[PDB]
Amino acid sequence: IHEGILFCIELSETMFKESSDLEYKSPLLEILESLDELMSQLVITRPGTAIGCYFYYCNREDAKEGIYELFPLRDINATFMKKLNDLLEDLSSGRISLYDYFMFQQTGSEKQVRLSVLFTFMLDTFLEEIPGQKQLSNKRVFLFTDIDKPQEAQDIDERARLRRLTIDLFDNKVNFATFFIGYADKPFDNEFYSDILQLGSHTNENTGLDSEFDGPSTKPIDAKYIKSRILRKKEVKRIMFQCPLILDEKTNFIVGVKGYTMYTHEKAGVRYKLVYEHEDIRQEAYSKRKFLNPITGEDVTGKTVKVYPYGDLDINLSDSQDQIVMEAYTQKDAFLKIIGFRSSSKSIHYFNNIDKSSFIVPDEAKYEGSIRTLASLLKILRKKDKIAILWGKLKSNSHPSLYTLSPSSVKDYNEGFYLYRVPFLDEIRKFPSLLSYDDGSEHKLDYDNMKKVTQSIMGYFNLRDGYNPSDFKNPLLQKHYKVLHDYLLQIETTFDENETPNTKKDRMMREDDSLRKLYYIRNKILESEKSEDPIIQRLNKYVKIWNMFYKKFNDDN
Amino acid sequence: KASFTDEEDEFILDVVRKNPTRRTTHTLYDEISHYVPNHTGNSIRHRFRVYLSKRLEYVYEVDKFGKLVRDDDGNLIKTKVLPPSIKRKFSADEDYTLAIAVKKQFYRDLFQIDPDTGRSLITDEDTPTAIARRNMTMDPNHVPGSEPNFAAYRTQSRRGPIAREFFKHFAEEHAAHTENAWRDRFRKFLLAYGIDDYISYYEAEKAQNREPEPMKNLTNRPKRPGVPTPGNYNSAAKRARN
Amino acid sequence: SSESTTFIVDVSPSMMKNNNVSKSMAYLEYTLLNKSKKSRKTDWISCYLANCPVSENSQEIPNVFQIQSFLAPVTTTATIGFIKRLKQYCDQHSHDSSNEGLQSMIQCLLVVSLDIKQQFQARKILKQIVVFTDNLDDLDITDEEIDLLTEELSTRIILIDCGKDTQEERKKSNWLKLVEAIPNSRIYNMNELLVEITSPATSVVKPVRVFSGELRLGADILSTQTSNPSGSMQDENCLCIKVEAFPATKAVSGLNRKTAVEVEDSQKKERYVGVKSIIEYEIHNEGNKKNVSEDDQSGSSYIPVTISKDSVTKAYRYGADYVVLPSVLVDQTVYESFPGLDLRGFLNREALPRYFLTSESSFITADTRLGCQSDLMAFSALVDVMLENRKIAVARYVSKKDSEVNMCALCPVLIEHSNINSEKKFVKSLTLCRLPFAEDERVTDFPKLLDRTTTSGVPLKKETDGHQIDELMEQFVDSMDTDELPEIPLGNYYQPIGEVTTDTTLPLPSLNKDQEENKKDPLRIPTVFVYRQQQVLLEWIHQLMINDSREFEIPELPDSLKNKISPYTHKKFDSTKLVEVLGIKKV
DNA sequence: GTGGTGTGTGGGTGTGTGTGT
DNA sequence: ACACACACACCCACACACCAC
């Protein structure tokens, strides 16, 4: 549930300098902006995350032995976002430069911190658990640096000491997440950090294999990808289900499977707390479901029996009878059974979704030889477009369904299967009873002209990039959490209803990301009208022709 | 939102109390939903019917002349008796009376005699006074001839003539409600059911000391499918008022 | 509308010895227990016995018995009583008082017609008589008899042919004259009815409109995002079509259960009444002080306290801060949206990943009850061109003014209609499913699968050998291939209510013959848990109340249901060697 | 004179949603 | 997934009306 991130950023003369990679944006400024965006997103997605940020080597008097604590390892707080946004505002307005803030004088021979004290501080930070906040379930360190060859790199004995410290960190469950930065004009050497941060995975002769885990991925990332890497590394794997996949029943050809929800439904205000406000003392108020006898009125919760009402008759099936009745098609625990493989052109449809899909990945902690089986199955399912029709329930307390295990394409970075759910015959609703059915088919010429005109319009608004969820923030959640944020910081809330048409429109597109693109569509239509060039003047002419065809038909019939 | 904010319940309860003659209607709740920023007429009517109908208690005084009703000072009086609806339901006695009236009118049209006794008369030297009512004389009774007068008369396959005068006279003599309701009741229920059939059914049920049910489920006319329903009070409208 | 059904079960020894009376009793039990779960006040039933050995009738006519008078609403207790009464009559009159030959069954029809005309003299009520007779070519209803019968009956006859045997040719007569004379009269074989009542029953949920607004492309955001009496047609250089949205694929809950408390009874039987749920709020007073001692003495206390809902406020969460919003800001914490479908762009079907779709499906169709047929042409042309170019459209979807804002994908789909004419005239409509937002995406990075590498990125060991692994798995996937089962055609996936509505709530083998041989689709299977518990309840009622049994004898799930939820078999194949070479061992 | 159609009501029922376990 | 309470859509037989040839 909880998680502790620890932003550790190493300071260098190049980091302060703006790079042409980010179009004259400093890598340190990019990291700070990524931190701000990450905290803003996490206060909505996952408020339980704990975040801290430390800089080094800096000359601040506040810096305890060379490490500067922008904000400690604490739970997400609005005060820290306000502090970081003040920092960003000072950087943007030019009030204080990064060099002035961090007191980093450009000499070309600036001192550096020794990694031993850095790693001990990393270990000690996760040890000083705050009494006012809950324990850390997951621990991470977001390591940013640009100096690939520190002083300790030359030595080999202190390399062993650093390895010992790294082993202690891993034993304390503090996994690393490296962000080593390399430039086009300056590549990044990976030997030292790879040497220290890995366990030394070596094959264990002919008496079996060794541990699959070896250490963090120390591959350098270009400065172009700093923000994209930070923002997509903040998410924790939220396991939905783990149910055995019984490919063949009789021969016990059964493997383990893990299930992760690719997407969810984020709601505006489900996270709250019922508060009993009595004068000045505020405390929690809990809600209970008290059951009442409609005859006597007694509190009957805890002494009720479930019965099946058919007509004016209640059928009291006991526990054993319910157990036997249910077991005709499903067991007590979650499972998924391979029923049959089918082509992908007859099973995956875009007009029959009933639920959000899940990501299936092997699980070898309960059934050995699952990764091999599912890797071979994934290889086979693609290169001849097919699926796996499944049958089971993903939760112990749920109802079975027939799914369509589909293999991920080679485009997606993630390797695994997607588990769509096929609607039952009951769930497939019926098309309504329309009040007219002679749309345009009998009028061949008018219908042909109108549909060719609508086809012409459609070609103008083709989405080259395709749908990207990151481009669309949820307007309700954005407004709700913005109100929360600016109330917590005593920032005046914006309210006005006498706005000019120019500024009200700007506010509407600022609050809604989709409205920006809708205004872009409207502007694209408008510009085709005003422009004198014939190659672009076609869009407004097509729209006007469509609007004339629209007006004609309600008169003819 | 998506609640009813008890002050809102009291507001709509008071609005219903102001018009007790429209408590079960459908337009009143549409107007309320127009005035209330939230909730639709269907939702408001359901809320009142299920929950707030138990807390009506009293309705502000309403008379035929008029609404509302105040005292000498100008205060609002609250009464515990709810005025009847705007659509008066029909009963067995009303249907029986209508059937008897139509049967007697049809019998008069053909045999020129009105049950039970009197016969037609024409003025020669002395008049029967007012000519608006029937010029009838009871003296030549009982007649020596044998006639089906009147219970033996069979009225099937007869549908007129009736005209507007007969129904105006019926509504006046019976001192009953509007003529259009009687005309529609007659044409749509009695004729499609049978005047003699209902007469015999009512008489038989009365003989066996049982209450006969009035005519029911005799629509006889289509609901006109293919056109919008006459009256919609859903989230679509929500009509604009001025 | 209002409907009434009447049942006539032949008791003559041809039925009794052939056990067709048991089939009739089972069918009546199913139909009446189906009618009881609704208990409509306008659903009349009445059962007679024809060619009965002992006759009791309201009109003093022999060989005619009314074993059950007219009943409405049908109830489970009444159904059980009537069914066990008919069973007792059958048991008592099976051998010692069995009739001979075939009596006059026409007399029963006249009495039933008279009773129907007594109960429903002139009401516009659908009256129905469903007779069960074992002989059609044997009983003789002459021309005068059929003429008088069709003069008497304005009601339809559903005659069930309980006696059918194999033969190189089938010929019938006599009974067809009465069926032909009376319109809407039908004839079925009883085994077909038994098969129909054995099959699961599909839901018949009425299509209720969800959204009503405009599908606008390029509409000005100033004239569409404002509370206005007029719609988006304030500009004349945009595209606007009035559409409405109905559910298309909604999840089904399990069979309804009720929590109840046992109460008293006349014979100390079981009577259950549903409880009422009231919400109640409480606080915990943390007074828990314990006195010190030199032993195990550590007594203390911990009790809650109930407080009203009036003095309770929501404290929203922002990171580590739980704050309560002032009244004015609560009005500001909600996004004020407006209904409508705003098109963002058109992308190819494969350019939208299938896992993006995140909610239940919905229909989009031109509004015909509040718009014009110009909307119909515009919508149909848009759907047709989207289908022709294989396009999906992403749109900003707000159903109603207070609802959330969604980004949704519009998929063009055709739907097949029988129509009044023989021409099928495919109906064009879009299908709407919502796409995720920025905050919805939970995509992480997982370890690679095909060519495994360590966490640091160096390649992993190639194990022993993978040459045979993929060949054996390939044979496994060809073993269970279901490509021989045809898929439902493009257009018949969604069927309109007009193809499923029936004038009578009686289980019949139906006339829609297109759905036959199109259930081979391995992916479209009937709901199985709901039908399983429905069948279990039906069998519980039957055994434990009608047959007076003592121990429940839970039935087996039918092989028709088990077939679609059990492994398929196209080519015979053994996976034991593949298991051995894949090294699978449960831990 | 009489048939045809139209609105709105009186008493509901059906379907979808939210919340606590 | 689950039951119960609640919000909103939908219905329809029919009193009550008006209009037209």
The architecture CATH gives domain A242-248+255-263+328-422: Beta Barrel (2.40)
Quote the radius of gyration of chain A (alpha carbons, Å).
31
Q: Which two tokens stand for residue A1?
A: 């549930």
CB neighbour class for C380 (10 Å; exposed up to 12, middle 13-18, buried from 19): buried
CB neighbour class for C484 (10 Å; exposed up to 12, middle 13-18, buried from 19): exposed
Together in a domain, B161 and B192: yes
Say yes or no for a CB contact (<8 Å) between C522 and A389: yes
Start-to-end C-alpha separation, chain B: 25
Q: In the B/C pair of chains, how many CB contacts fall below 8 A?
A: 28
A299 touching C (Cβ < 8 Å): no
Chain C interface mutation, best of A246, A350, A538, highest count of C Cβ atoms under 10 Å: A350
The C1' atom of E6 and the CA atom of C199 lie apart, in whole Å, by 35
DSSP 8-state symbol, A332: S
Rounded CA-CA distance A137/A114 in Å is 29
Give start and end residues of each alpha helix (H) in A203-318. 226-231
Q: How many other CB atoms sit within 10 Å of the CB of residue C123?
A: 16
- B44: in domain: yes
- Tell whether the torsion through CA atoms of C353, C358, C359 and C365 is positive or negative: negative
Domain boundaries, chain A: 3-231, 242-248+255-263+328-422, 275-326, 444-556
- B234: in domain: no
User: What's the Cα-to-Cα distance from C275 to each of A309, B54, C255, C279, C306, rounded to whole Å?
Assistant: 13, 21, 18, 13, 21
Beta bridge partners of A181: A221
Domain boundaries, chain C: 3-198, 273-324, 460-486+512-587
* Cα atoms found within 13 Å of the Cα of residue C528, Cβ hemisphere only: 27
Compute the residue count for chain B.
242
Q: How close B150 comes to chain C (CA, Å)?
A: 25
Query: What is the helix (H) or strand (E) element at residue C393, kind and residue range?
Result: strand C391-398
Say yes or no for a CB contact (<8 Å) between A314 and C260: yes
Q: Which two tokens stand for residue A405?
A: 């295990």
Within 210-239 of B, beta carbons closer than 8 Å to C belong to: 215-220, 228, 235-236
Rounded CA-CA distance B77/B60 in Å is 6
User: What's the Cα-to-Cα distance from B151 to each of B108, B148, B199, C357, rounded to whole Å?
Assistant: 13, 7, 10, 76
The C1' atom of E4 and the CA atom of B9 lie apart, in whole Å, by 22
A535 SS3 class: coil
Beta bridge partners of C441: A263
Residue found under tokens 């004419």: C421
Together in a domain, B42 and B102: no
Rounded CA-CA distance C359/A357 in Å is 10
Query: What is the helix (H) or strand (E) element at residue C475, kind and residue range?
Result: helix C467-479
A489 touching C (Cβ < 8 Å): no
Query: What is the helix (H) or strand (E) element at residue B137, kind and residue range?
Result: strand B136-137
CA A254 to chain centre: 31
Rounded CA-CA distance A138/A46 in Å is 13
- B231: in domain: no
Rounded CA-CA distance A180/A146 in Å is 6
Together in a domain, B128 and B158: yes
C463 SS3 class: coil
Within 310-329 of C, beta carbons closer than 8 Å to A belong to: 311-325, 329
CB neighbour class for B217 (10 Å; exposed up to 12, middle 13-18, buried from 19): middle
Q: How close B144 comes to chain C (CA, Å)?
A: 39
Tell me how many domains chain B contains: 2
Quick check: C487 and A346 in contact, CB under 8 A? Answer: yes
- Tell whether the torsion through CA atoms of A287, A293, A299 and A302 is positive or negative: negative
CB neighbour class for A161 (10 Å; exposed up to 12, middle 13-18, buried from 19): middle
Structure obtained using: cryo-EM
C489 touching A (Cβ < 8 Å): no
Residue type, C412: P
Q: Which of 3.40.50.140, 3.40.50.410, 3.30.70.260, 3.30.160.270 is the CATH number of A3-231?
A: 3.40.50.410
Q: How close B217 comes to chain C (CA, Å)?
A: 5
Q: Which of C150, C148, C164, C132 is nearest to C50 (CA)?
A: C132
Rounded CA-CA distance C535/C543 in Å is 12
User: What's the Cα-to-Cα distance from C106 to each of C65, C131, C142, C149, rounded to whole Å?
Assistant: 13, 11, 10, 9
Give start and end residues of each alpha helix (H) in B51-178. 92-111, 163-174
Range of the domain at B201: 88-218
Together in a domain, B92 and B80: no
Domain C3-198: assigned CATH number? 3.40.50.410
Residue found under tokens 């060697």: C577
Secondary-structure percent of chain B, ordered helix, strand, coil, rounded to 5: 40, 5, 55
Given B71, B87, B103, which residue is the final one in a domain? B87
Give start and end residues of each alpha helix (H) in C120-236. 143-152, 175-181, 190-198
Nearest-CB residue to C212 (from B218, B219, B236): B236
CATH at residue B118: 1.10.10.60
Rounded CA-CA distance A126/A368 in Å is 34
DSSP 8-state symbol, A515: H
Beta strands in A415-488 (DSSP E): 417-422
C210 touching B (Cβ < 8 Å): no
3-state SS of chain B? CCCCCCHHHHHHHHHHHHCHHHCCCCHHHHHHHHHCCCCCHHHHHHHHHHCHHHHCCCEECCECCECCCECCCCCECEECCCCCCCCCCCCHHHHHHHHHHHHHHHHHHHHCECCCCCEECCCCCCCCCCCCCCCEECCCCCCCCCCCCCCCCCCCCCCCCCHHHHHHHHHHHHCCCCHHHHHHHHHHHHHHHCHHHHHHHHHHHHHCCCCCCCCCCCCCCCCCCCCCCCCCCCCCCCCCCC
User: What's the Cα-to-Cα distance from C416 to each of A63, C423, C497, rounded to whole Å?
Assistant: 74, 10, 11
Q: Which of A293, A225, A238 is nearest to A264 (CA)?
A: A238
Residues 6 or more apart in contact with residue B17 via CB below 8 angstroms: B56, B58, B59, B60
Rounded CA-CA distance A81/A89 in Å is 12
Together in a domain, B95 and B214: yes
Torsion of CA C461, C463, C465, C469, to 10 degrees: -110
Nucleotide nearest to C123 (CA to C1'): E13
Rounded CA-CA distance C24/C82 in Å is 13
Looking at chain A, the number of H-run helices and the number of E-run strands are 15, 22
Resolution limit in angstroms?
A: 3.1
Say yes or no for a CB contact (<8 Å) between C438 and A470: yes
Q: Which two tokens stand for residue C267?
A: 């014979």
Protein residue at shortest CA distance from C1' of D6: B230
Quick check: C273 and A305 in contact, CB under 8 A? Answer: no
